Amino acid sequence: HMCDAFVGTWKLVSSENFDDYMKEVGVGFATRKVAGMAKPNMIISVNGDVITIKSESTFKNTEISFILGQEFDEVTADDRKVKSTITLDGGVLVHVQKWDGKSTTIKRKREDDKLVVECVMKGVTSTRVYERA
């Protein structure tokens, strides 16, 4: 029941400061522009201890499956090869990606009927708000 409130299909409805976040991460111009247009559907499911998060959009379709606290390899939508660990901290899913001596954290939170995604790279945060699809 660990992620009950996250499970479901969610659609992006707003984004703030995402271009700057992507710049800070190192994403190039053309990828930033096409990625920034995307309105993904995020599909979260749980089967036993395995959590799956899919992101489907015109830009890219991605899928990760993981166990909390157990590091895994991820190829991000912008093609970084990262080492990821996802944990639950006080009801927030905290996803840390490490690559090339850099780090970024993506937090997913349930707030009212929304799922809020906060992405941080050094001093730069972006907030992406999803609603149930």
Binding-site residues: 128-130
Choose among 32, 30, 37: nearest CA to 19. Answer: 32
**Shortest spacing between CB 47 and ligand WQH, in angstroms:** 21
Helix/strand/coil (H, E, C) string of 104-116?
A: EEEEEEEECCEEE
- 21 and 27 in contact (C-beta within 8 Å)? no
Choose among 23, 25, 126: nearest CA to 80. Answer: 25
Q: Which of 44, 51, 82, 106 binds ligand WQH (CB under 6 A)?
A: 106
Which residues ranging from 34 to 93 are in contact with ligand WQH (CB under 6 A)?
35, 38, 40, 42, 55, 57, 59-60, 76-78
**Shortest spacing between CB 34 and ligand WQH, in angstroms:** 9
CB proximity list for 93: less than 8 A, separation 6 or greater: 3, 6, 86, 87, 107, 108, 109
Give 48 or 116: the residue with its C-beta nearer to ligand WQH. Answer: 116
Phi, psi for residue 53 in degrees, rounded to 5: -120, 120
**Shortest spacing between CB 48 and ligand WQH, in angstroms:** 23
Give 36 or 68: the residue with its C-beta nearer to ligand WQH. Answer: 36
**Shortest spacing between CB 113 and ligand WQH, in angstroms:** 17
* Binding site, annotated residues for a fatty acid: 128-130
Distance (Å, rounded) from C-alpha 101 to C-alpha 23? 17
Residues in the site for ligand WQH, rule: CB under 6 A? 35, 38, 40, 42, 55, 57, 59-60, 76-78, 106, 117, 119, 128
